[PDB]
Amino acid sequence: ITPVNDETMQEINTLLIALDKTWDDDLLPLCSQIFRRDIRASSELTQAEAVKALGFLKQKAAEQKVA
């Protein structure tokens, strides 16, 4: 389906920053393993993929304090 929108991107970026994680180091690698495509940039996800990643980041951010 269609590419990730800027509101979803900004929600993901907010959570990455809160978690002390990055696209390059953390999330792009994980998305590539989970979705089994080769994802090399944050704008290259689909909206459906991004929503799945955002749900996972919310769980992480809700679970515990960042050390």
Binding site: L19, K21, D26, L30, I34, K52, A53, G55, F56
Partner: peptide
């Protein structure tokens, strides 16, 4: 296949 619904470390 691991999934975003799984208790994946991050």
């Amino acid at each position: 296949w691991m999934d975003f619904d799984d208790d994946i470390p991050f």
